[PDB]
Amino acid sequence: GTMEELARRVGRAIERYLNGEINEVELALAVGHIFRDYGLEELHEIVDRLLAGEISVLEMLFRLYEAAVKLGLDDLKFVLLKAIFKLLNEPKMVKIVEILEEMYKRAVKKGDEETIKLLKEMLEVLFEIAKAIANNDKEEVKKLLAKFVLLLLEMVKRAIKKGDKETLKLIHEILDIIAEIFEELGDDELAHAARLVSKAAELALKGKKEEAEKLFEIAEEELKELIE
């Protein structure tokens, strides 16, 4: 069939595994069969490695995400990222990925192609964040989240000069979630920068976009300072 259904099938299999309905061998067999039905041989080999017991579910998910990045499948990428962020107990990251998926789905139905590369760099940053979390190395997580906040700042700067309004709300929600994450990680300056960007986006959405440029430059200067 089409690549959209394939992602739905794989996602349903992974949710069945996560909820406890099926086990690892059943999940491996089902996902390998699904991938083989669509002709994806590399993904089938990666799942075969799980079927042999060499790797675990999280490692298989990481390798599947890398392979899908090489191939260029988007819905499968979002499904795999949500599964990765659900295997690790982080509901906030899953919420961020869900909002980004909604943004991507809104973007693909129109001619906006400049945002797609953004939405993609941010997916790479999210993948690096997940990898760093899996390594239990908390120092790189903050820098990667700072890069994510900078990317969202660039996207909101692009969006303000246009007439979009739902994009502003979604970026505000994402930035609020990241600020909460920063607060839960024992950091205050990066959380303050994220809340500054969120406040600037809120001001721009409200109608007073003249006050937003000073907030934007202050926030970007602070973010650049804190990364180094």
Residues in contact with its own copies by CB under 8 A are: 9, 12-13, 16, 22, 25-26, 29-30, 32-34, 37, 48, 51-53
Q: Does 42 bind Zn ion (CB under 5 A)?
A: no
- For Zn ion, give the closer residue by CB, 48 or 173: 48
- For its own copies, give the closer residue by CB, 23 or 89: 23
91 interface partner picked from Zn ion, its own copies, none, CB below 5 to 8 A per type: none
- For Zn ion, give the closer residue by CB, 4 or 188: 188
How far lies 163's CA from each of 149, 202, 207, 217, in Å?
Answer: 22, 14, 12, 21
Interface residue with Zn ion among 5, 26, 37, 41 (CB under 5 A) is: 37
DSSP annotation string for the chain: --HHHHHHHHHHHHHHHHTTSS-HHHHHHHHHHHHHHTT-HHHHHHHHHHHTTSS-HHHHHHHHHHHHHHHT-HHHHHHHHHHHHHHTT-HHHHHHHHHHHHHHHHHHTSS--HHHHHHHHHHHHHHHHHHHHHTT-HHHHHHHHHHHHHHHHHHHHHHHTSS-SHHHHHHHHHHHHHHHHHHHTT-SHHHHHHHHHHHHHHHHHHT--STHHHHHHHHHHHHHHHH-
Q: Does 225 bind Zn ion (CB under 5 A)?
A: no
Interface residue with Zn ion among 184, 188, 221, 225 (CB under 5 A) is: 188
13 interface partner picked from its own copies, Zn ion, none, CB below 5 to 8 A per type: its own copies
Q: How far is the CB of 98 from Zn ion (least distance, A)?
A: 28
Q: Does 189 bind Zn ion (CB under 5 A)?
A: no
Q: 10 with 34: CB under 8 angstroms? A: yes
Q: How far is the CB of 15 from its own copies (least distance, A)?
A: 9
- For Zn ion, give the closer residue by CB, 48 or 59: 48
Report which residue's Cβ sits closest to Zn ion: 48
Q: Does 26 bind Zn ion (CB under 5 A)?
A: no
Q: Does 54 bind Zn ion (CB under 5 A)?
A: no
Site residues (vs Zn ion, CB under 5 A): 37, 48, 188
